Amino acid sequence: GTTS
Amino acid sequence: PWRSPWAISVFAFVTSLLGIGLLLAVIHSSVTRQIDPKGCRMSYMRPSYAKLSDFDTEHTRLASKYSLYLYREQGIDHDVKVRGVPVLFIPGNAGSYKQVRPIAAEAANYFHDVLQHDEAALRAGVRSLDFFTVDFNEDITAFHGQTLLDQAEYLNEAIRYILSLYLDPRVSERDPDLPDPTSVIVLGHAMGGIVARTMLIMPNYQHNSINTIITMSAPHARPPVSFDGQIVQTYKDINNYWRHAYSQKWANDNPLWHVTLVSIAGGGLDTVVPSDYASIESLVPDTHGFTVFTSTIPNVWTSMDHQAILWCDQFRKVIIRALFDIVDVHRASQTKPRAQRMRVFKKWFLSGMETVAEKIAPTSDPTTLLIVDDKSDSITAEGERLVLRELGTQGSVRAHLMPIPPPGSPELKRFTLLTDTKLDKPGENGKLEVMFCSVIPSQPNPTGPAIPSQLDLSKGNAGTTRLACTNVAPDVITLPASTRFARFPFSVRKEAEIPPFSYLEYVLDDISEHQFVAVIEKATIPTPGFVIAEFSDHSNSHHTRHIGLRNLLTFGISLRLPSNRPMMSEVRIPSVKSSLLAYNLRISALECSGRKDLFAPLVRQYLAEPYESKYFVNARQAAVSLHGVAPYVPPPMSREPEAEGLAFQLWTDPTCNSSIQVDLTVDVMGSLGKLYMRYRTVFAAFPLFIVSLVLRKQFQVYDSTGSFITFAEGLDLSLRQSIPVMLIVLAALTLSTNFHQNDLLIGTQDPFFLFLIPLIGIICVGVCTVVNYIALSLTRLISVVISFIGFLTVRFGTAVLLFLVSTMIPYQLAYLVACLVQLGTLVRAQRISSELRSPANSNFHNYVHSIFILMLWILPINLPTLVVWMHNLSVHWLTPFTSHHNVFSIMPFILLVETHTTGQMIPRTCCVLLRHITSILLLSLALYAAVYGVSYAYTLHQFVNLFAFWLVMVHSTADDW
Ligand SMILES: *NCCOP(=O)(O)OC[C@H]1O[C@H](O[C@@H]2[C@@H](OC[C@H]3O[C@H](O[C@H]4[C@H](O)[C@@H](N)[C@@H](O[C@@H]5[C@@H](O)[C@H](O)[C@@H](O)[C@@H](O)[C@H]5OP(=O)(O)OC[C@@H](COCCCCCCCCCCCCCCCCCC)OC(=O)CCC/C=C\C/C=C\C/C=C\C/C=C\CCCCC)O[C@@H]4CO)[C@@H](OP(=O)(O)OCCN)[C@@H](O)[C@@H]3O)O[C@H](CO)[C@@H](O)[C@@H]2O)[C@@H](O[C@H]2O[C@H](CO)[C@@H](O)[C@H](O)[C@@H]2O)[C@@H](O)[C@@H]1O
Ligand SMILES: CC(C)CCC[C@@H](C)[C@H]1CC[C@H]2[C@@H]3CC=C4C[C@@H](O)CC[C@]4(C)[C@H]3CC[C@]12C
Ligand SMILES: CC(C)CCC[C@@H](C)[C@H]1CC[C@H]2[C@@H]3CC=C4C[C@@H](O)CC[C@]4(C)[C@H]3CC[C@]12C
Ligand SMILES: CCCCCCCCCCCCCCCC(=O)O
């Protein structure tokens, strides 16, 4: 995934 | 004669135009002038949260409203088990529990990548950090004090649950020989830092359960707004608790003896919480905590938002490294002792050039013995700078030994070394190693076995002088890389980051026991790198400019540092202390003749009062904004005269043989825009100073002539005599061991800042005029809607309110409803006055309008409590209300609004005594709003309630009710  | 409510005097219009103009100039120049560079690199992660749903209403009543989560980073944390040190993150006013993503992910990754393989660090007691985060439903703590207390109580119970987790084999996997955890590390953001401090004074606090508090952008010194009395009282409680506890002489009597509090402030880019309020200098002694700005944190060197302080990449790396250097799972409190924690926090958060900085190498154990020939080719003459323009010219390991001058001379001397090359740690091979060498006597005098001591022999002959040498890597000061291709101390792109400079600064007395400073050039092939080392005299390097603030603001200050100046120069202006004044710094071009300079000039703009240093790489033109003596914060503690005011530390290449010019002038518009953070809260109370003086003039003329003039006409009459006189009284009031000296009026008793009283007065005059016109427009607009409904019809065709407040309605909802009913009465009065245009109908309209303006200027204070109550209803939380306080806080307004709906005009006013009571009450309200309005804005509702009660008494029995 990965978010900020 | 009938004078329109819309008409305004030229005098009152011009003054209101200047007030609105000065408001726009302050607001505009606070978002465009003296703005710090933004240098936060975005952080990305894979978030996951495990709700600890077994922490329920059996443990605390608030668990039906609040929730606790364990952060799990996907790909690193594969199960919901605790395996390390518990850390608790507390979000701020309307913050999210999900704001723990960046700091918790960095901790999860760093232990995975580095520490879990480091067997020595694991042997020393380092484990994972378990990040627990708390869901407060985005509750507004800054505006409600019972919310703050509820959060603190919930989190004390949550800490008990968290520490119970480490007792359960089904939830905890730890080494069996480890002690049980008895403490949690608390990281708080904004009002979370206050919840963290509030937690230690609550009755359900478990002793020794918190020893480490780190807060990011938390207003420790002062409440952000004072709209709630419980917030103000809780701030008094916690601030008094810290001050009283740390004022104890015997540590056993000090409840906060083992507690360290570190306050990190975003700086000038933080527009939610003023960075002035983050100062804990009046709360925590330097042995137990400090306030640091993100602009002085090494490898961060940037200012931050309120929200960016959590997700900044550079900052999260630093905070995680600091947190990993304090944990110790061999101790039941999962941290190192208090002094060791303070030393680590100073290493990771501070520049290293502070007075509280500790020097390790001068008095530590030697780590190498250097054998060097007796020919003394390495040993240079005293008083010569060592300049290495390239590393590895000769092709062999070299030693440059610089003899330390004898301490016989009285004047203070320093050794300074600057290099762009990384300095080798002990027992490591690199390009460069710097070390303090002491002569080993040729006589076989017994000493330590020197088993850790490695040996470097560069003699290659029969001379073979022996030196015991200590590596200085422990005390290296990291400086931002100042090259010609650099503009900021940071880099938002990781690829473009320049490896920082290395700096050593020592007082001669610290290292006098040694005999040499050895710069070991280990490079063989020519590689880029420079080294400058020298001893300098305090007279040659440090300059102080004793120039008054008046002359500095008039002319500015200009210096000419000579060509024969050291690498590092300091310029101190002791008269630059205010946080309200901003400057412009200019550094002249370095006309390096022939050769290029080894590095570009570096300027460190720093204050000792909080730890705020700002770096300007390749400095030519710098905006100087400092967080010094702020208005409403507790007074600064005592300091030596050598640490007062603002200082600039300058690094230039000393081999250029060119003088440098430093200019410092005042930035008038930047200084003007500095006022927004400091005085924004003045505008919930101080416009009531103008309104009360206008209502005083309206009632004076009415009681004397029987014509109740319009608000604009009352303002015109007040600006001529009444308002100017009472601003002079406020100025005279300001001129006439206490930590609350700075809570009243303009926050400062300094005479220089007396112009702030006229400034605030004129801006408040403009704001009151604008709000008057807004209310007139709203009345006319509702009247137009009513007339339009009437035409559409024509062409196409009590005493119960007391019961409501006592049961469930907070008096703020009743106050809003009273304001709406007053607006309805105002619309009715305006319509009647337009239809009939009687002098009696103009009086009632003007009177109702002025009372509406008075009611409307209190609504800002009451509105925050409505949003809290509506939110709690949404969450299904019910808060009981004390009927005695609700009824007495709203009944005078209810009775006044009812009397106005009956259409009764205030009776005109032993009779002169009743005439003077209205004047005295309104004068006292004006003065009270001006003086106690910033710090005690919650009392204005009660005082205006008292005024509404008197007007109900004049209405009743001073006439036929
Ligand atoms: N990766 C890692 C991470 O990342 P992220 O996260 O993604 O990040 C990044 C990003 O960012 C951004 O964005 C962001 C994001 O977000 C997300 C998030 O979300 C959430 O969280 C959130 C929360 O929730 C919220 N709430 C917030 O919070 C906060 C907290 O935190 C804190 O703590 C506290 O403190 C606070 O701050 C809070 O907030 P609040 O509370 O809410 O708010 C506050 C403020 C604002 O408010 C407003 C106010 C109101 C209004 C009113 C006013 C008044 C008015 C006036 C008057 C008028 C009247 C008229 C009259 C007439 C009558 C007659 C009749 O506050 C403030 O600000 C204050 C100030 C202002 C105010 C006031 C003033 C006034 C006045 C004054 C006057 C005058 C005076 C003057 C002068 C005088 C003097 C002179 C003479 C002498 O926030 C947070 C965030 O963080 C969560 O999530 P959830 O939960 O799931 O969800 C929920 C939602 N809600 C978390 O988790 C997350 O994370 O995103 C978004 C989108 O969506 C956005 O939006 C945000 O922002 C961006 O970027 C950025 O970043 C940073 C930020 O963050 C920065 O730094 C940078 O730079 C950039 O920009 C993006 O792009 C990114 O990506
Ligand atoms: C700086 C402050 C004054 C901002 C408010 C400006 C606006 C709302 C004010 C300033 C001067 C005002 C005008 C002054 C005089 C009159 C004459 C009157 O018979 C009708 C309204 C009218 C035409 C006013 C309308 C509103 C007005 C234009
Ligand atoms: C006569 C005029 C000035 C009255 C209008 C002022 C009202 C609408 C304003 C003034 C200050 C405002 C508050 C300032 C900031 C916050 C924090 C936020 O998290 C919730 C809303 C809340 C609590 C605002 C509610 C509305 C508020 C009370
Ligand atoms: C006309 C009325 C204007 C009054 C000005 C009020 C300014 C409000 C300031 C907001 C306080 C900070 C909000 C929460 C911040 C925190 O979490 O600490």
Author numbering:
A (entry chain B): 1 to 4
B (entry chain A): 138 to 873, 895 to 955, 983 to 1094, 1102 to 1153
The authors write:
Unlike H443N, S327A did not show activity even with prolonged reaction time in our FSEC assay. In addition, hPGAP1 S174A, the human counterpart of cPGAP1 S327A, showed no activity in cell-based FACS assays. Therefore, we co-expressed cPGAP1 S327A with TGP3, purified the complex similarly to cPGAP1 H443N, and determined its cryo-EM structure (dubbed cPGAP1S327A) to a global resolution of 2.66 Å. To our surprise, however, the density also supported the fitting of the products (TGP2 and PLM), rather than TGP3, as similarly reasoned for cPGAP1H443N. Consistent with the structural observation, a significant portion of TGP3 was hydrolyzed to TGP2 in the cryo-EM sample, as revealed by the FSEC assay. The discrepant results indicated that the S327A mutant became active during purification. Based on these results, we concluded that cPGAP1S327A also exists in a product-bound state. Despite the overall structure similarity, the two product-bound structures (cPGAP1H443N and cPGAP1S327A) exhibit notable differences in the positioning of the TGP2 sn-1 alkyl chain, offering insights into the processes of substrate entrance and product release. Conversely, in cPGAP1S327A, it undergoes a ~ 45° drawing compass rotation, shifting outward by 6 Å and detaching from the enzyme. In cPGAP1S327A, a blob of density fitting well for a cholesterol molecule occupies the 1-alkyl position of the TGP2 in cPGAP1H443N. In the two product-bound structures, TGP2 was built with a C18:0 (cPGAP1H443N) and a C20:4 (cPGAP1S327A) 2-acyl chain without causing clashes.
